[PDB]
Amino acid sequence: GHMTGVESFMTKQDTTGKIISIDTSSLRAAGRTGWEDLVRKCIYAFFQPQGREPSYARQLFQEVMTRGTASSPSYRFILNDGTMLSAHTRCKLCYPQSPDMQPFIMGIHIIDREHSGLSPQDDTNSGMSIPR
């Protein structure tokens, strides 16, 4: 919790409830590869149907559309590396005032790692041809 972190991303949906784009600039600051894998996995679960009930995304949609703001619970998922991590999502309705465009839904996804899993492995590159 708190305002301490960085591993996260946001989504942009048009007036059609469709995804127009995604903002993962934050993940880029994490310096940890696989962001795409974590982003897809988290999004897959968020939009995943809860058994006989509708997906979480739907619940937050009607809530953010009727209230203007919604947030889903913390879900857990396994990455390609078998890593088990949980994350949450929140929908926020936004309507353009200056520009003559339509309102869009901003979906923020926060990553939450149960156990500590960020060892000093900042050493993926080094060479390339013939450095100094």
């Binding site: 949906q13 007036t15 059609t16 409830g17 995804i19 127009i20 784009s21 995604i22 993962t24 795409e36 982003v39 897809r40 999004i43 897959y44 939009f47 509708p54 997906s55 995304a57 739907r58 949609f61 009607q62 559309m65 309705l93 339509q102 309102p103 839904i105």
Partner: protein, 32 residues
């Protein structure tokens, strides 16, 4: 009036997998 009110579709259908990889790459133009 309000769009999202019913413009976001009550069904809410997620993507497939080609839309996420495309929006995740970003670039607008595609060098090449």
């Amino acid at each position: 009036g309000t769009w999202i009110g019913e413009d976001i579709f009550p069904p809410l259908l997620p993507p497939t997998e080609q839309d996420l990889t495309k929006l995740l790459l970003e670039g607008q133009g595609e060098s090449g």
